[PDB]
C-alpha cells in the first residue's frame, strides 16, 4: 500500500527478528505468525492472545520446522508465502475501507493464506485457522471518524424518507458532510425560497457541470445549525434519488406509482424538503418528446408547498417550464447560480487535494493549483471555469508521479542485466550441469538486490511528485488536451506565434497581445479571447495564426472550428455548389456555429470572409463578441469562453498578390512589402458594415504572393508533404536547398506559383519514396533532402 | 416553533423544579421523567402513573443518581439528552393530533429518546419504556372540529367510491368544509345545466390558474343543504382523481383498464356527479397529440348522462373538443369562469395565513396581501391571478425571516469568539496544561451564555414578523421576480424609470403615467397594461425604457420580450437569411410573438421597427393592442392583457442621425437636438399607419443622435467587458473622462468608431491588469478608471 497503521508495520519487523531469534535466517509465514502474536494486543496480536497462542508458543513451533540451528543471519527478508500473506492483508484493508492497513488484516491474510510454517504453528496451538481470522475480523480495521450521535426516535417521519432515500441531515449530525465548497453565494437566495408556503420550492439555474451538488449539502448544515427561519428549524432535508426508484422497475407507469406514493408521505408538509436533482425530467414539459410527465401530480403539489423542493437546472431548462405553467413558474423562484467566479473555483480544488494524495501526488503545488483555475479558464476552456481545474491539477498530479516509476537514477541497466542472468543460468541447468547454472544463479541474486536497491533509490522521484502536481506539469495537462508551461505559454505567446507564422510580424503581435491581456486575466472568460479580422489575400499568415494561436494559445497546436461566412449569405453553396441543402445563414446561426463550439467551447474560431457575408451574419458574429454566448440549436447556449474568433479578409488583394517585382529597381520588392503591410488595414471595413467590426478588437495584417512571398509558399506546402510521412513511420525534413530546386519549376509568370505542389511530387514525394525503395534512406531515421551543386541529394542521418 | 399547549410546557417546568429539590443542578433527563409523572394526570403523567410510577418513584430514583446534593442552581438549564426528548415531542405533535405539543408528547418522546437519563430511570423503576409510550400515545384525545357520526345509508355505493377517490360531500359532513372562496357566481350556472339530464354536463372554461377547483367544493356544500332540486338534494359528487389512476399503473392499457372499472359502475347514473378537472386530457381528440383516447367508453357516457359530470378545461383548451360533436355538444354547455376578480385571490391569502404564521411572516400585513395580487397581477403575470399573489405573500414570507436571523444586534462577532475559545481550551487540555485550558473553558461558556442571550434578542425580529408580510417586503419579493416598494415603484413610476434611464423625460412620463394607472389596479387584464408607440430612429432610449419598465418599476431584473416586425415581414422578409423558413408574418403570430408571451404573461413585448412592417402585420398586431389576447399556435390563448406592447418608429433616420455642425454658429447642434425631439413626433407618421397607433396608451417621445453617439459606444463596450470580469469577481467602474481617453483612439476619420473596442483593451482590460499585478488595485475592491490630468488614472475605492 504505502499507508498502514503501527501495529501493522510493527508485526512486519517482527518477523525478522523472530528469523534468527529461532535459527532461521528466512522469514517464513512462520515469522509473520510470530510477529503477530508478539506485538502483543494490536487487533492481529490481541486475536491470537485470545485464542490461545503466546509469543513463546508460536516462536518455538516456527523454531521446530527450521531453527535450532541454521544460524548466521543469512539475509532476512520474505520467502514467497510469507509475500502472499502481506499481500492478502492489503485486500483485507481495502475489504473495509482501512486506506491505511491495519494489524488485524495481517492475521486475516496469514489465515486466508494458511500455508507455510505459521500455518502449522496455529493449526498445532489448538487454533483453527479460521477461528484466529474471525477474531481479528470482529474488531475494526480502524479507520472510522462516522458518527457523533447516539440518539433515538420514532416520529410521522418514518414513512416518507425509508423509500427513498438518505437524509443528508444525518450524515451531518455523523461529522461526515462536507460543504463542499462552491458557490457560496450560490447557497444564500436559496433560503428565501425555501422559508415560504408558496413559491416555496428553488431552482437553481447555471451549468450543472459546475459542481452543482455543492450548494445542496450547504443547505443540509445550515438546517441543523443554528439560526436560520422559523419553518428551517423545524425542516428536515429529504432527498429524491433516482436511483433506487429505477432499481428493480423497468416500466415508466411503476416509475409514476412510486412517485405518487412518495407525494402521499409527503404529509409531513411545511416541513418537509424534498431535493430532486435534474428537475426536467419528471415536468416532462417542452421539447418534441417527453421523459415523464409527473405533472398531473407534481404540479399541484409544487405550488402548493407540500412539496417544497429544489430542482438543479442547467442553461436552457427553465424556458420549458414557464412555458408550461402556471403551478411551474408559482413554485419556481430564481437564484443565480455561476460557473464559479475565479476564486470559488481555486477553494474547490484545494478541499480534494489530499484524496489526488489517495490518488498519491497532489498535495500541492500551490501556484499549479490557482493556475489549474486561471490556466483552465483561458487555456481550455472546454467546461465550466472549476471543472477544468481540477483535472489538470490530477493529470499533472500524476503525469510526474508516473516519472516517479520507470527508472532507477539510471540504473535501468541493472533490470536489464538480472534477465541476461536468468537466461545463462537457466538454459544451462536446463540441460545440465548443476553449478553450470549456480554461479549464474548467485550471480543474480546479487544483482537483484542492486535493481531493488536502485530502485527504491527511485522512490526519491516519488518524494518529489508524492505531495506536488507541478506548476509546468498542471500547465502541460492543459497543453496536453489542446501554471508554468502554460503560463509561460502566455508570457512566451509571441515567441511561440511567431515560430509558426512567416510573413507579417504586423499580425502575429497584434493577436499576442490582445490575448495575452485576457490570458493574464483580465478580460471576459465567457467571451472570445481575441476578436481578430485576419487580413490579406488567401495564401499567407491568416489560418498559420489561428493555428499557432492554438499552439501558444491552448498549449498544443489542435482544436480550432472553421466556417466559412462567404457560404453564408444563402447563395453560395446554399444549394449552388458543395455544400449542403439548407437557407445558409439560418442553419449557420440556427446550428452550424453554435454546435461546432459547443464542441471545444475553447476552439479557435475561423469566421471565413465576413466580407463577403451578408449584412445578417455580421449581427450574428457581433452576438457571440456583445453576449459571449449564441443561442441556437434548441435553445442550447454556446459558450464561446475564450475561443479566438478570427474573423478573415482577401482583401487587398492587387498589390498583396502581385510581383513584388523589380519595378526598374530592386527596392520595387522591398517596397511591394512596405506597401502591402498598409493597403490591408483600409481594405477589410469597405466590405463590410461597421456594427460588427467594433467589437473586434485588434486589425490583424497579411498579404500573399509576390516574388518573394511565393518562396514562402514554397515552404508551406513542402512541410504539408513531410508531416503526411511521418504515420508510417519516416522522420523527412527539407533543408532550403531542396525547396529552391523545387522552385526552379514554378517560378513561371505565366502559370504562377501553382506548379510548386507539383513539383514538390516530383523531387520530395516521388524522390523521396523512391529512394525509400531502393533502401538508402529508411524509416526511423531523419531524412534530409538538400541540393549540393544544383542538384538534389537525398540524405540520412540519425 | 413556540406553539404547544398547558399540560406538556407544564410537565416540562416541574422537572427543574424536582431537579433542584434533590441535587441535580443540570436538570437530567431524569427530571423530565420525574417531571412527567409529578404533573399528575396528565397523558405524560397519567400514562406513568399507570404501569405503576409516582411523583415519588421517579424522584426517588432521580435522587440516586445525582445524590443530595450539591444544590445550589448551577447554571440551571435542562441537559442535552432532556432537549432531545423535547423535539421529538415537536415531531409527535406534526404527527398526532394538534399541531401545537401535548402531554403525550413529551412522554411519548422520552420514550423514543430512551436512553440516558430517563431511560435509565425508568429501567431502574421496573417500567419498560415501550410500555410508558404505549400509555401515552393512546390518550392523545379526540378532536373533533364540529363532527357528528353514527351509520351509513345503502348498499349500491360498494365498488365504486372505494377505488378512486374522495368525495367533496364526505368532508362537509363531518365540518371539515373548506371556505371555499370563488368565484361564487360561476356555482350557480352549473345546477342548470346538471339539473338536466340532456346537456347534463356543466363545463367550466377559464385560467388554471383561476382556481377553478374552488368552484367545485360549493357545489358539494350546497348538494348536502339544501338549495338544489328535488333528486339534486340526494346527488353524491364524487372526483375523478389522476393520482389513483396513475397509482398501481404499468402501461396505457392499464390506465384505460381503471377507466372502463368506473364506467361499469357509472350505473349510480343520473343521481352521481362526476367532477374531472383537466377534461380535454382523457378524450385525446384534435392537436397533433393526443394524451390517451378516453373518447370512446366516455362520449357515449357523455350523451346518456351516465357520466353527468362537470368538465374543468383552459381559457384556450376546449375548442378542439366541442369540434367532435354533437353528443358532446349535447353533453357539454359552457359557463363563465372569469380571470379572477381582484377580490378573490385577496381572500385566498388570508384563508392561508396560520400556517404562513407557521414560517411566522403572517398573520397580516393586509395591504402587502392586496398588493400580492394587484402588483402580480399587472406585472407577473407568470401565472394566473391568485398564484401570483400567494407567492408574493410567501415569497415575502421568508426575505424577513432570513433578516431575523443572520445576526443577533451584531454580536455575530461573540459566536466568532466562543468558536476560537473551544480550540484553544481543548488543545491546551490536551497538553495537560491543565490550567492553560481552565480559563478557557471558563470563557467559553461565557461567552456562550452571552452568545445565546443576544440570539434570543433577535427574537424581537422575530416578533416583527410573526405577524406582519411586510408590504415593502412584498414589494422586494415583486422585485426579485420581474405593496410597499412596489406600489410605491407605481405611484413613483416616472422616478423609478428615471433612476434607471437617463435622458427622454418626454417618453418617461407617459409612459410611466400609463402603466401605473393600469399597474395600480384600475385598469382590467383584457387589453395590455400599455400600449405605446416610441419614437425616434436608432440611438434613442426606446428599447431601453420598455427595459426599464419591467426592470425598474416592477423588477430589479428580467420580463421584457423584444420582437422585430421588419424581420416577421410579408415583402421585407418571407424566408430570407437567418431564421426559420415559414412564410414571415404567419410564423411570428401563428407561433412565436403568441409563443413567447404565452410564458410571462408580462413582459413589455417590444415590437421593434413596426414602420417597416405593412399595414397587413399591423391588424393582428392591432389586436394584441386591442384584446389583449391573440390566439394562435394551435389555438392557444396568449396574455398580452399584462403586457405592455411598445411598438417603435424609425423611418425619419437621416434627421434623427443628424449632426449640425455649422450654420454660422455652433448652436446648431443644440438646435438640431431640440429639434430631434419634435421631429420623432412626425417620423410616426411616415410609415405607421393611424389605425394601428390609436389603440395605445400615450405617445412615447424620444431623440438621438446629435452629436454624441461616439462616447456612449465606448459606454456600452467598457461595461459589456467589465460586468463579465464582475463575473470572476472583479467590481470596475469606468468614469466618463477614462471613456473619453479610450475615445482618443478611434476618432480616426477612415477606421471608424472600429478603435473603440481596442482602445478600451488597452485602457481597462491591460490597464487593470497592470494594476492588479502590482497591487495598486484589488480584486474585488471597487476600482474606478478616471483621466485626472488629460491622462488616464487608475484609482481605488472599497
New interface residues.
Partial sequence: FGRFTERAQKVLALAQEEALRLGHNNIGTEHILLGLVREGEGIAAKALQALGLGSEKIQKEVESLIGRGQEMSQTIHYTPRAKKVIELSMDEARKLGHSYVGTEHILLGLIREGEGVAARVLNNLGVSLNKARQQVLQLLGSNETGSSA????????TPTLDSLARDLTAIAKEDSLDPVIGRSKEIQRV??????????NPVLIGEPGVGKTAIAEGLAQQIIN??????L??KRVMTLDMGTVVAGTK????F??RL??V?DEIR?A??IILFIDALHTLIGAGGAEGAIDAS??LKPSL?R?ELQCIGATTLDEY?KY??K???L??RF?PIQV??P????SIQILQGLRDRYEAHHRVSITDDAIEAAVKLSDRYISDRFLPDKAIDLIDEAGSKVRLRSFTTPPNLKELEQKLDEVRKEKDAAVQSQEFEKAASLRDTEQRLREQVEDTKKSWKEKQGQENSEVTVDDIAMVVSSWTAQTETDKLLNMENILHSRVIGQDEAVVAVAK?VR??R????????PIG?FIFLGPTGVGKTELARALAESIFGDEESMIRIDMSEY??KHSTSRLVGSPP?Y??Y???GQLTEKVRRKPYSVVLLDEIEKA?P??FN?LLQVL?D?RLTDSKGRTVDFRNTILIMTSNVGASELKRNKYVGFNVQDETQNHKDMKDKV??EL?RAFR?EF???????IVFHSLEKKHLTEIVSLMSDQLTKRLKEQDLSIELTDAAKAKVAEEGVDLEYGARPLRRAIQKHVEDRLSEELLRGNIHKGQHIVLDVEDGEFVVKTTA
Fill in positions: 447516539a440518539g433515538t426516535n420514532s416520529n410521522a417521519n433560503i428565501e425560497v425555501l422559508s415560504r408556503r408558496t413559491k416555496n443554528n439560526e436560520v427561519p422559523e419553518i428549524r423545524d416500466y415508466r407507469g411503476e409514476e406509482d405518487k406514493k407525494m409531513q411545511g416541513n398531473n401530480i405550488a408547498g424556458r414557464i412555458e405553467d402556471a403551478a413558474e408559482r423562484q455561476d460557473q467566479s475565479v476564486d470559488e490582445a491581456r485576457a493574464a486575466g483580465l478580460k471576459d472568460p465567457k467571451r476578436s449569405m444563402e437557407g445563414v439560418g449557420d446561426e440556427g451578408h445578417d451574419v450574428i456583445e459571449g488595414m483600409g471595413k461597421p467590426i467594433n467589437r473586434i478588437d485588434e486589425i
